[PDB]
Amino acid sequence: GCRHVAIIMDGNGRWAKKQGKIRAFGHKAGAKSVRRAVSFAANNGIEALTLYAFELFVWALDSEVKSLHRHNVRLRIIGDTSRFNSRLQERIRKSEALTAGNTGLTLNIAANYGGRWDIVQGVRQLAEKVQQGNLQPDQIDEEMLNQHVCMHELAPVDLVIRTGGEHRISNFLLWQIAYAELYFTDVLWPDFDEQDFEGALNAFANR
């Protein structure tokens, strides 16, 4: 019954250091874990999967987009990409446009995202409307702010997973997690595998 899973993918640095290796090695094992979690969600009928890594990261996704598209995956980047270079912004817009019509798993990749930023960008929009005389203070309600925060078109976030041992949201989704199950595991992101993902889905199923 779990429709939308968000993951705070923490522990790449600590994993690398445990393996006696440099940071980049953790990243490469992190990316393999990303692919495994994406495959697992698409195989198990999850509607939306939202991943928060806790420009270089987005660039690496770029070469995977053709393969996501074949898999009927809809890709979106959420977060403030407005100071990214224009070449990268255009590559992001093209990948989103390429997959926007896909009807399988929606994969949201947070890039320079903050939950408070997300709320503020939606408040800014309402503020522009009030100034234009197009809305009244008294008309702003939860429903309306909801319509201006990221992911408002998707199933509500049902489950948030944080790997890596910390017990904090760290300014990932805030508005969107009002009623979500929160599942924290000490497993580090590169080790987080199908069995760990299923274990989290069980916690939800028990709720």
Added chain:
Amino acid sequence: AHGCRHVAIIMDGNGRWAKKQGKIRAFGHKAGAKSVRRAVSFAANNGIEALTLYAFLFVWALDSEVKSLHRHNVRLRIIGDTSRFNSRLQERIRKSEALTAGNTGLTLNIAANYGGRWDIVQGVRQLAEKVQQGNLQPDQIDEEMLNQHVCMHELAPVDLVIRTGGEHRISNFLLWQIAYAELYFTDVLWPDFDEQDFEGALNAFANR
């Protein structure tokens, strides 16, 4: 030493506690009120600056505790949407706030008809009002600004959120305010949650 200035607690488990012992709901609420007094005293004696309680006619007959709070030098505040509350419910709240506002010990915030989303929304409305008066430009609105308009912005940031009763969600409780907070869930039911359980959450925040 523990390092929390501000602890918030989702106090769940009262109903389950009373059921476990074949008692009706009201006996749980009552054990739960005893557990509130205990948590309040414990916070006041362990140098916490602020304790924010979300209970998950509660507020009413609770007037009857305001004199006792005042005698413990606790500053009382109600957060939440009380604007559609009964005549004078609103007045007795205001006088309770006024009476204790000079207190210098623990600040105790009691959520009454509170939701985290509503909290953000009221702050957004204060901001929209100022835009409409021509006082505020949309592009001056940043996080620091909205932060100044949500409940409790003048108190230390929330360091730690405790939720008793075994569920692992926020259930709409502080959403903006808990962006950086430690989250601590215990299966202990609210009426059983005692000083050593509170110590255990604080020491967990200190170690983590």
